[PDB]
Amino acid sequence: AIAKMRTMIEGFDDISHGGLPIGRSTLVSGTSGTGKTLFSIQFLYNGIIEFDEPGVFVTFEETPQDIIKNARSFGWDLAKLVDEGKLFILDASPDDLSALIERINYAIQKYRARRVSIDSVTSVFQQYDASSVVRRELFRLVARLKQIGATTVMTTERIEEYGPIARYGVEEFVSDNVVILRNVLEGERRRRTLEILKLRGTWHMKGEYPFTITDHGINIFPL
Amino acid sequence: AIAKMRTMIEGFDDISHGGLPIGRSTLVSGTSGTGKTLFSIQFLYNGIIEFDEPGVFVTFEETPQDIIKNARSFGWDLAKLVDEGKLFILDASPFDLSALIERINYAIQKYRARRVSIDSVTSVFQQYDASSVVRRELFRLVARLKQIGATTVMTTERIEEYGPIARYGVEEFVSDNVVILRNVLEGERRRRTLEILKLRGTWHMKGEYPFTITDHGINIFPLG
Amino acid sequence: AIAKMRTMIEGFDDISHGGLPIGRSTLVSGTSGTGKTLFSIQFLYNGIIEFDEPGVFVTFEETPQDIIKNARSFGWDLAKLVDEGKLFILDASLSALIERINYAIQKYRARRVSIDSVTSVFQQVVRRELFRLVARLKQIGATTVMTTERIEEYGPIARYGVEEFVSDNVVILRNVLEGERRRRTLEILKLRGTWHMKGEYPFTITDHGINIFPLG
Amino acid sequence: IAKMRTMIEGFDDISHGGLPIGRSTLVSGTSGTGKTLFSIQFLYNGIIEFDEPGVFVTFEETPQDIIKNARSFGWDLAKLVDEGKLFILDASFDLSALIERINYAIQKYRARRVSIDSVTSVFQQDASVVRRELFRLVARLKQIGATTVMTTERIEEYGPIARYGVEEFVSDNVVILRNVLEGERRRRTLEILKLRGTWHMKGEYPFTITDHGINIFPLG
Amino acid sequence: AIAKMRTMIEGFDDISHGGLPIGRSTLVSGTSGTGKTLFSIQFLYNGIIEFDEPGVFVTFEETPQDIIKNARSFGWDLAKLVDEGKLFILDASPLSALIERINYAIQKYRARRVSIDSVTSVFDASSVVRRELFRLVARLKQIGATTVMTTERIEEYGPIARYGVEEFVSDNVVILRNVLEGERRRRTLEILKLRGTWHMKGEYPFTITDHGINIFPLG
Amino acid sequence: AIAKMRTMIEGFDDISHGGLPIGRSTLVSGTSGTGKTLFSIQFLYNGIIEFDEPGVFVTFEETPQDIIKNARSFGWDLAKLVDEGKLFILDASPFDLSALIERINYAIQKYRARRVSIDSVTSVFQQYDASVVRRELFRLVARLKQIGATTVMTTERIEEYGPIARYGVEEFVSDNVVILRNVLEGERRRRTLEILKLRGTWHMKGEYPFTITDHGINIFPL
Ligand SMILES: Nc1ncnc2c1ncn2[C@@H]1O[C@H](COP(=O)(O)OP(=O)(O)NP(=O)(O)O)[C@@H](O)[C@H]1O
Ligand SMILES: Nc1ncnc2c1ncn2[C@@H]1O[C@H](COP(=O)(O)OP(=O)(O)NP(=O)(O)O)[C@@H](O)[C@H]1O
Ligand SMILES: Nc1ncnc2c1ncn2[C@@H]1O[C@H](COP(=O)(O)OP(=O)(O)NP(=O)(O)O)[C@@H](O)[C@H]1O
Ligand SMILES: Nc1ncnc2c1ncn2[C@@H]1O[C@H](COP(=O)(O)OP(=O)(O)NP(=O)(O)O)[C@@H](O)[C@H]1O
Ligand SMILES: Nc1ncnc2c1ncn2[C@@H]1O[C@H](COP(=O)(O)OP(=O)(O)NP(=O)(O)O)[C@@H](O)[C@H]1O
Ligand SMILES: Nc1ncnc2c1ncn2[C@@H]1O[C@H](COP(=O)(O)OP(=O)(O)NP(=O)(O)O)[C@@H](O)[C@H]1O
Ligand SMILES: [Cl-]
Ligand SMILES: [Cl-]
Ligand SMILES: [Cl-]
Ligand SMILES: [Cl-]
Ligand SMILES: [Cl-]
Ligand SMILES: [Cl-]
Ligand SMILES: [Mg+2]
Ligand SMILES: [Mg+2]
Ligand SMILES: [Mg+2]
Ligand SMILES: [Mg+2]
Ligand SMILES: [Mg+2]
Ligand SMILES: [Mg+2]
């Protein structure tokens, strides 16, 4: 039974049946405001507080200052974790992504990070305007992350709740695990739901499970 | 956590739970005739009248005169406010947008502006056929305004009521906040609803809430 | 309150609440055979008969001879109105076209204008040229009705998904098929700076042109 | 606006006189809806009923095939040809060449009625300018003053009127032929969507293809 | 009164009302596994075993080895019919060149029937499909042989073929469906169109058995 | 009749009425996480442990280590079979497929292999921007047919009731077509397998429920 690392996110370990596979890549996809960024922070936060596992958060759009400010919403002082050397926020914003895939390796080995979060991968391709080389590029990242033995959570974007899993119809096949966050609207009201669509070489709960965002972060309800 | 300024739009400060996050940009998407322009004016107007916060209105298609004429409808004397140096209308009528971002930055400092609104970003990218660089250039704009520390309202256009949030399916991800105006047709009648889809770092009411455009602007109805 | 000119089309002036905003462009979009041309004609016709306001008609496919033949169907004598210099039909069957229109508006002193249809010019960069025309017509200060085509009754407003945002006002004409039967409805989607009735309202085409039925 | 009687049972009722004279009419429809049969009858009825000569223009099917297929309804097209009342123009990037060739036949035969089947096929034989070229034909035919029936093809029954979403706007009139499937069964319906400068009945009307051709039931 | 050629497929000659029109092209479109190949094999097989009519089968993907093996599932020795000269499988695994090879085969074997499975496989050459399909169909008509061309489609109630052009280039059109509803499949055949002649309309239930295709007429 | 080799995957040989046709290619199409890879492993694993039949696995995305690591959860010692020379994982990780067609032909002949799994044929054309698929795939199908190998090729999907594969050509190139579904209704998923087509042989029609237990795929014939 492939080894998993407990995420400690209320409910997720029940749905995943132990947490996220170690050294494997997990895609957390969702429409805007589904809780993709939040999930990836709480994945790094819980690893530091509950198992003293150093974390790397790579951001292509939001700035370290903003990721911190927005985290203070949930009573998390990411400012302190940065000083203590437990967390590292890599800013990869714009002024073959082998230039960046090496910059992350340098931080992982430097900080000795077990957990990694990339948010959001899609933007790199949407910034470079190169929707051709996506399956090849996303694979070079996942593969180079698999060689360092690091448990990774990458977020992607989508336009619909029951349409393609991601934006290019390929990211689901380059990742080991696939988690889908939905914010479905029916009758003028929204319903947040989480779903582990796939986990390679391990069991998990199927279908969508309700969750809500509170002052303590994500809280999923196993049924 | 993140502070927010009151828009003073009847009902909106209840949905948003205090107003719009300060120094962050908010996207207001919608089909044609949903109230995007009204929203961006009422934002700037209220900020000047109730708080003395100066503001800058960026227009791409509509002319300054048209904006002043259309606003007189609600008893808002925008012309007066331009003379006082309280409101400034930047005309951006007719691939990079750095020249634009610098002109907005100049007005902001020249008028000591607190609030800003662009209406509408989409049209700029369509008037130059530069559609493969929207996420790049929109981010450059939203990133600059963040440094200047201005609360910005950007309006975007959509073609469907329950389809993509914006035109190119990217604008939603670059903005900190996302408001969605709707004008749904069902049974040969129209229903106007507003939804705050996302507010980064803060809480807000979820789902779409009804509103109407009265003789005194937008009026939203919270349900709890 | 923005001033409006009465179209004199039965029902429409109730829905629009006085008529079309003066000096602005109004998009009239519809599928094939919805009454786009008819609306454009009736607009100019009623302007001449009811207020002696001269009119200009820009045609991009139908010839002036067919526009007059098709108008005779409703008992209108466009040939007479032309011969009096009260109506001008510019046969165009985008900067060079504006020069043709501006010369005609000034020559005839035309307060109303109809363009049928804008879309065809492109199918024969749409936001740029559409905005060029609409911006120019505004500077001249003429009230315009531009017709536009569509394929679906409840799909895009126009054909490119841009025309709706370039026009100050939008009117959608529908001819919906339900249970092998056709229902004609008109709707004012948007009017910048002024109020109007929302939703679709039933209408018919008779021997006196379009007749809309405002509900309340 | 004057109308000529098509003599197709029911059509002159739905159209309220027939087809606007000197105008072009589009007959759009999916495969096997009866676009060809409609265009043959328009000509045939004109020849036998009013001695109005007819010009049929075919891009795909051969003049021998169009005759062999009509003999199934008891129509002798070979006779109308030998008489010099019907002409079958075999037309198996501009359409100006075709327009001139078509005008030769109209003038030669002193034809009043014309039918083209089908204009879609010429544009795929790859000029997907169709509006510009389809307007060149319609404008010239309107200059000649010949009442024309041009068939067009479509893929969906309740989708676009034609194939390129343009043809319908260039034509003076539009007739949609449908062959809708439901419960594993097919129902044939005809509808006049548009008749410029004149009145007509709205909605779809049932019809069948008998051994005597098209027959439409006008409910009203 | 266009004369028909009996296909000898149980039920089809009732739906078609005599069979397929002689010297015409019949389009048999259908999604994957609807019986397209099987139909075209029975057309030749039945023609040879009953009317002594030599057949020319054209294949662009399938090998003449696999076609003979597949037919042998229904007790059809296409090998023996090949030896006698009554059948001739033309392998076209890699367009006026093919028409010369086909007209050669039809004339060289004094053949009445023809099958082409499938015309979709031939065509990035999509901008000349109508033109090239019309070149073939026109060449086949002038030759004077009854042809059966199969075509592919994606949806059961979507386009009749794969390009929205083959349906009009052909004289006759048969649509084979394999509709899925409630986790079960439902095979039906439909003659959408037959030029110059009458046929039965709508879908008709059919099954594939040890004796080939079996259609159920409701009339 | 067309000869078939038993897959030994519970229920499959009932639906297929004997197994997969010998020397013919079979397409296994499905959305992400439907069980395509798992199906392609169990195929080769069952052939070896039951019939001592050597198999080759052509992997594009997953590494040889992961395919083995993932199989451990079902108690399948894939590492042992690589050492015993009964299984070979061809690492095809990084428009012509000729180099691959010869590498595969080498492994087939060099290991006396009769079963072949290719996971997944769609990824190659995405990784090389070759979206010449009907052209290239036909070369692969034709080659494998000549060599005399029973092949399982998995294709990707986006919709459960839409196109069978990604390009709408792969279904017509293959001799046989299996479809895996993971349909969502009422917030709950449901796994079903379907044999869409089998050239020259009979099979059970429609969708059949299945699950993925501690011993692989289990299908329930109805
Ligand atoms: N004085 C008024 N009283 C009531 N309703 C009004 C008044 N003025 C405008 N409206 C309505 O409110 C709408 C305002 O449109 P606007 O604020 O320009 O929306 P928009 O989304 O910016 N349109 P567009 O720019 O075409 O996308 C109009 O369509 C009118 O129906
Ligand atoms: N303190 C809080 N309490 C409850 N909900 C909150 C709180 N803070 C943020 N949220 C919600 O969480 C959302 C932001 O979560 P986030 O993880 O940024 O989503 P996302 O999918 O990353 N959005 P985007 O980056 O635009 O794709 C907002 O839309 C809020 O509704
Ligand atoms: N003699 C006849 N008696 C009864 N029905 C017939 C007869 N001839 C043809 N039909 C039917 O009527 C249809 C007429 O076909 P046709 O007029 O060619 O339609 P179409 O729309 O032109 N086909 P296409 O050219 O493929 O677009 C045929 O498909 C037959 O089903
Ligand atoms: N005298 C009349 N009485 C009743 N109805 C009429 C009369 N004349 C025209 N119509 C109707 O009006 C329609 C044509 O109106 P028209 O104004 O040409 O529409 P349109 O949208 O411009 N067509 P198109 O130019 O192809 O997009 C026809 O479908 C007729 O049913
Ligand atoms: N002996 C048999 N008994 C019953 N059914 C059979 C038999 N042989 C084949 N079949 C079925 O018939 C189908 C084969 O028909 P075929 O003509 O190959 O379909 P097709 O439409 O040509 N497929 P494709 O070539 O991929 O487009 C298979 O899906 C089998 O289920
Ligand atoms: N050991 C196990 N026990 C029970 N279930 C499992 C086990 N391992 C995997 N699964 C489930 O079975 C599924 C099969 O995965 P897999 O065969 O990789 O699907 P796939 O369609 O190949 N995915 P992709 O490669 O992304 O297209 C996994 O997603 C798990 O949900
Ligand atoms: Cl919530
Ligand atoms: Cl309102
Ligand atoms: Cl009416
Ligand atoms: Cl009938
Ligand atoms: Cl069956
Ligand atoms: Cl399961
Ligand atoms: Mg985010
Ligand atoms: Mg506006
Ligand atoms: Mg018109
Ligand atoms: Mg025809
Ligand atoms: Mg086949
Ligand atoms: Mg896989």
Numbering used by the authors:
A (entry chain B): 17 to 111, 122 to 249
B (entry chain C): 17 to 110, 121 to 250
C (entry chain D): 17 to 109, 123 to 153, 159 to 250
D (entry chain E): 18 to 109, 121 to 153, 155 to 157, 159 to 250
E (entry chain F): 17 to 110, 123 to 151, 155 to 250
F (entry chain A): 17 to 110, 121 to 157, 159 to 249
Q: How is this structure described in the published paper?
A:
KaiC is the core element of the Kai oscillator and provides a practical means for studying the essence of the clock mechanism. In the presence of KaiA and KaiB, KaiC rhythmically alters its own ATPase activity, auto-phosphorylation/auto-dephosphorylation activities, and assembly state with other Kai proteins with a period of approximately 24 h (Kai oscillator). A recent crystallographic study by our group revealed that a structural change of the C1 ring upon slow ATP hydrolysis (~11 ATP d−1) is a determinant of the period of the Kai oscillator. Using a series of KaiC mutants harboring a fluorescence probe for the C1-ring structure, we obtained evidence that the structural transition of the C1 ring is coupled with ATPase activity and the phosphorylation state and is the origin of the basic timing cue for assembly with KaiB.
Substitutions were designed to cover potential structural changes of the C1 ring, as revealed in a previous study by our group14: S157W, to monitor fraying of the α7 helix on the inner-radius side of the hexamer; S146W, to detect the cis/trans peptide isomerization near the ATPase active site; and S229W, to monitor the protomer–protomer interface on the outer-radius side of the hexamer. Therefore, the KaiC hexamer undergoes structural arrangement while maintaining the framework of the hexameric C1 ring. KaiB-induced fluorescence quenching of KaiCS157W but not KaiCWT indicates that W157, located on the inner-radius side of the C1 ring, is a sensitive probe for the conformational rearrangements that occur during assembly with KaiB. Moreover, the plot of 1/t1/2 that decreased hyperbolically with increasing the KaiB concentration is reminiscent of a conformational selection mechanism in which the conformational change in the protein occurs before ligand binding. Furthermore, exchanging external ATP with its non-hydrolyzable analog, adenylyl-imidophosphate (AMP-PNP), resulted in disappearance of the time-dependent change in FIapp after addition of KaiB. Under such solution condition, stable KaiB–KaiC complex was not detected even after long-term incubation. According to the conformational selection mechanism, the time scale of fluorescence decay at the KaiB-saturating concentration should correspond to the time scale of a conformational selection of the C1 ring before KaiB binding. Consistency between the 1/t1/2 value of ~0.5 h−1 (10.5 µM KaiB in Fig. 6c) for KaiCS157W-D/E and its ATPase activity (12 ± 1 d−1) measured in the absence of KaiB suggests that an event required in prior to KaiB binding is the slow structural change of the C1 ring from pre- into post-hydrolysis states. Taken together, the complex formation between the C1 ring and KaiB is regulated both by the phosphorylation state and by ATP hydrolysis-driven conformational change of the C1 ring to effect a rate-limiting step of the complex formation.
